Design a protein around this ligand. Structure first.
Ligand SMILES: O=C(O)CCC(=O)C(=O)O
Ligand SMILES: O=C(O)CCC(=O)C(=O)O
Lengths: 402, 402
């Protein structure tokens, strides 16, 4: 009955657990679902059509494991036009989603004992992927008064000789924060003084961004091109959740080793999805009006929640600059009791209270390494969001702040 | 410039290397391509249509990571109807292809130092996937006079306390051999006396089988259900190479741990591919007439090559019982010299000679752990095969046997 130590010490993704729990409950139990971050739009018409055309034209046989040339060349043009980055097509590795991209990158560059520096709140997979490579997660807490942005001084103090990989998610999952160029530059100068330290730049939410914030690719900073693994994809910006199409861009020697690894553990992205990705990149800079319409809806949802929830006593919010998540501080309510439920002690019991007693499904902050908050996804309709706020207010009424 | 020890010691899949080499050469250089094993048929009409319908009906948003219920239930019915196996839907884990299925299975059950028993000739990824889990490959050579089938006595001798996983590929890649029930039973009784030993049963080529041979699922043998991880898929039988749809069936506790792992490192199979898989399973027992037509073509190609190549001096062949590979013994020609090329010393130089001087691309046996042979894929037309044989004859003419 035994299992490997790597897998048995692995922690289930609470994002997926709660999501599937809410789905299954939706039996015949109506639950407001704000856990997993999945765009509530159809794949854009021309993208879907390219996928259909791929099938109809029999584009279902062997394709290059690393990705078809047509897609990798289109990805190089995107990186240059949108991010100012110069890559050759063999510096691109196309995978089945960004989760696989990140894993292969970590396995490729992290030796046993190496330290992976992960700012909190973090996306749930960063720590677990680190452990899978026999690497040691080095978590750096951030503060809500600082938009959950990394403080350079904290970075420096935690650097050792074993420091190998720094993970930079911008715009962030779960906080929605966007690293300004100013801060990236300071981090860069720190990185530059540590020959062994590489940077993983997770830019999947790049186009989900709200003015005046701007996205700055870390590979674009002075001396950082040689240090940076750029991870990006299609699912969030183009509503291609079921397609699964991610990619990695980076230094030749690293990308070549990830491609070798992928060749032994994966078949690569589907040929059908890759054709769809080509058409998605064909929509123009930043996905054009297609993606702009979607961003405009996200922005309207953001503003509704931020004003609605921020008014509430003992609720603290950082107005997000991108993505589609709110990382809300309800910690003031910890220590109080809700009749019929019990004590609200932390983010997990609070979320469980929201779910059991008010049928709203959110994800507790402890899954992202910050127990002071709970994450809401607002890739859902405005009416759902209105109903969710009404329930959150009612839920917090019998509780006590601080 | 450094990389992890796991990845730098990883060996590139020569199957993919030669395949991409031949493709790229096909510039404007005509090469007979018989390396990678990819069906030369369109995805069946109703399967392709289900994929198109999935896209058109907007089935592109969140799906359960482990696989949609509809597909996992259909997979359970297949396993019962075709293989005599009883699984619950939560004993099925749907992945992006069988390569990922196998990796997660290995990472889940193999602790560092555990030994993975791999009969040779083997599929190229088994040893490398073992190393990725910090496990130790234990290769057992087989003999061509014995249809490259495992000898129980050799299995017993190599068993230690560190023995954790035995990998059984039937019908085999690369040899095309099919394990009879008789032999599986003897192996089973050996397995049964070693509490820690599990079995990975790779049955992806199950329906590509030529009478009188029959496929016997290892999980069906006495006391083996609790010991067996069954890996299967869609790409080979249903010509779904670009779809990427594999699955694992096994004991609940193991499958649950693989599902947890998959949740942190992958997004799972595309939603579009999963709908296509449902329709594929809907074709009936063994894929019905659809798959039967394809098997009939493979069988005709097998018979042509086996008679054509077997006549040639110093060429030894085992008539395959399934899959679509020939593992041909040219070793008699080793030690001879070909003017304009040089010495033919082993399977790699021989293959290189075929490729450079006669534009036929095959894969040397050393990639499968047996340097005495070279592998040919006959998932190509009869005319290509006829041309390949004509070139192989001409190539061997100036060489010397034994
Ligand atoms: O699974 C993904 O890749 C995106 C969805 C996600 O992880 C999240 O909701 O944070
Ligand atoms: O890559 C696959 O999964 C099947 C093709 C293959 O590996 C082979 O030709 O042996």
């Amino acid at each position: 009955m035994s299992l490997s130590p790597r897998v048995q010490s692995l922690k289930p993704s609470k994002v997926m657990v709660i999501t599937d729990l809410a789905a299954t409950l939706v039996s015949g139990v109506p639950v407001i679902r704000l856990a997993a971050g999945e765009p509530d739009f159809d794949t854009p018409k021309v993208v879907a059509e390219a996928g259909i055309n791929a099938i109809r034209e029999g584009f279902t046989r062997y394709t290059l494991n690393a990705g078809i040339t047509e897609l990798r060349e289109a990805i190089c043009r995107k990186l240059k036009e949108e991010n100012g980055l110069s890559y050759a097509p063999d510096q691109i590795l196309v995978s089945n989603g960004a989760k696989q991209s990140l894993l292969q990158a970590v396995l490729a560059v992290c030796s046993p004992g190496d330290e992976v520096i992960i700012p909190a709140p973090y996306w749930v997979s960063y720590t677990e992927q680190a452990r899978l490579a026999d690497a040691t997660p080095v978590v750096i807490p951030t503060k809500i008064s600082n938009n959950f942005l990394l403080d350079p001084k904290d970075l420096e103090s935690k650097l050792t000789e074993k420091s190998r990989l720094l993970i930079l998610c911008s715009p962030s999952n779960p906080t929605g924060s966007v690293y300004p160029k100013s801060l990236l530059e300071e981090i860069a100068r720190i990185i530059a003084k540590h020959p062994r330290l590489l940077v993983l730049s997770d830019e999947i939410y790049e186009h989900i961004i709200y003015a005046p914030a701007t996205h700055t690719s870390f590979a674009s900073l002075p001396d950082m091109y040689e240090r940076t693994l750029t991870v990006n994809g299609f699912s969030k910006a183009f509503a291609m959740t079921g397609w699964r199409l991610g990619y990695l861009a980076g230094p030749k020697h690293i990308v070549a080793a990830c491609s070798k690894l992928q060749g032994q553990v994966s078949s690569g992205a589907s040929s059908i999805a890759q054709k769809a990705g080509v058409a998605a990149l064909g929509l123009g800079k930043a996905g054009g009006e297609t993606v702009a319409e979607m961003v405009k809806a996200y922005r309207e949802r953001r503003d509704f929640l931020v004003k609605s929830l921020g008014d509430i006593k003992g609720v603290k919010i950082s107005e997000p600059q991108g993505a589609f998540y709110l990382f809300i501080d309800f910690s003031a309510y910890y220590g109080s009791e809700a009749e019929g439920f019990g004590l609200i002690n932390d983010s997990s019991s609070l979320a469980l209270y929201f779910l059991d007693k008010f049928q709203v499904a959110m994800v507790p902050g402890d899954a992202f390494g910050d127990d002071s908050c709970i994450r809401i996804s607002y890739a859902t309709s405005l009416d759902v969001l209105q109903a969710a706020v009404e329930k959150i207010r009612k839920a917090l009424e019998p509780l006590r702040a601080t």
